[PDB]
Amino acid sequence: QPRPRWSYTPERMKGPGFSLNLVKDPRRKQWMVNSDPAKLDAFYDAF
RNA sequence: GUAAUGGAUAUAAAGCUUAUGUUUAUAUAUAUAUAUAAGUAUAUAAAGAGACUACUACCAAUAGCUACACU
Ligand SMILES: [Mg+2]
């Protein structure tokens, strides 16, 4: 049984695990993305 | 209001696709022999010359003109 491609990232495409580029504001590094399939279906049944 | 030709704020990454250099021996055996030694040319001439076209010359064919001085 494989995994849905939208759920995970290919393990072999990741690298060191830390970010090599500098950021001016650490607050801009945060953003909440949706991962609930049920919540995604609540939008299609509307639109 | 002013600034950006490598702007700005985020995002991803890792044994080398750098506009840069120097070097380049066969055979045999467990030193001897041979004599420059990585290999390569589906790349590279113009002292002069050929062909085609054009220009400048020379030349006077073709064409036009001249007969009571030709027939
Ligand atoms: Mg004539």
Structure description:
The structure is cut from a larger assembly and holds one chain. This protein has 47 residues and is mostly helical. The protein is built from 1 helix and no strands. The protein is flat. The protein starts with 36 loop residues before the first helix and ends with a helix. It binds one RNA strand of 71 nucleotides through residues 13-16, 19-21, 23-25, 28-29. It comes from Neurospora crassa (strain ATCC 24698 / 74-OR23-1A / CBS 708.71 / DSM 1257 / FGSC 987). Belongs to the ribonuclease III family. Mitochondrion-specific ribosomal protein mL57 subfamily. This is Large ribosomal subunit protein mL57.
* Ligand names: magnesium ion
Fraction in helix: 10-25%
Indicate the structural class.
Answer: mainly alpha
Count of individual helical segments: 1
**What's the SSE pattern?**
H
PDB class: translation
Keywords: Neurospora crassa, translating Mitoribosomes, mL108, translation
Entry title: The structure of the Atp25 bound assembly intermediate of the mitoribosome from Neurospora crassa
Name: RNase III domain-containing protein
Can you summarize this structure?
This is Large ribosomal subunit protein mL57. With 47 residues, the protein is mostly helical.
Task: Describe the structure using short key phrases.
RNA-binding; 1 helix; 1 chains; flat; tRNA; part of a larger assembly; translation; Large ribosomal subunit protein mL57; binds magnesium ion; mRNA; 47 residues; Neurospora crassa
What's the helix and strand layout?
Elements: H1 37-44
The structure holds magnesium ion.
The protein binds one RNA strand of 71 nucleotides through loops.
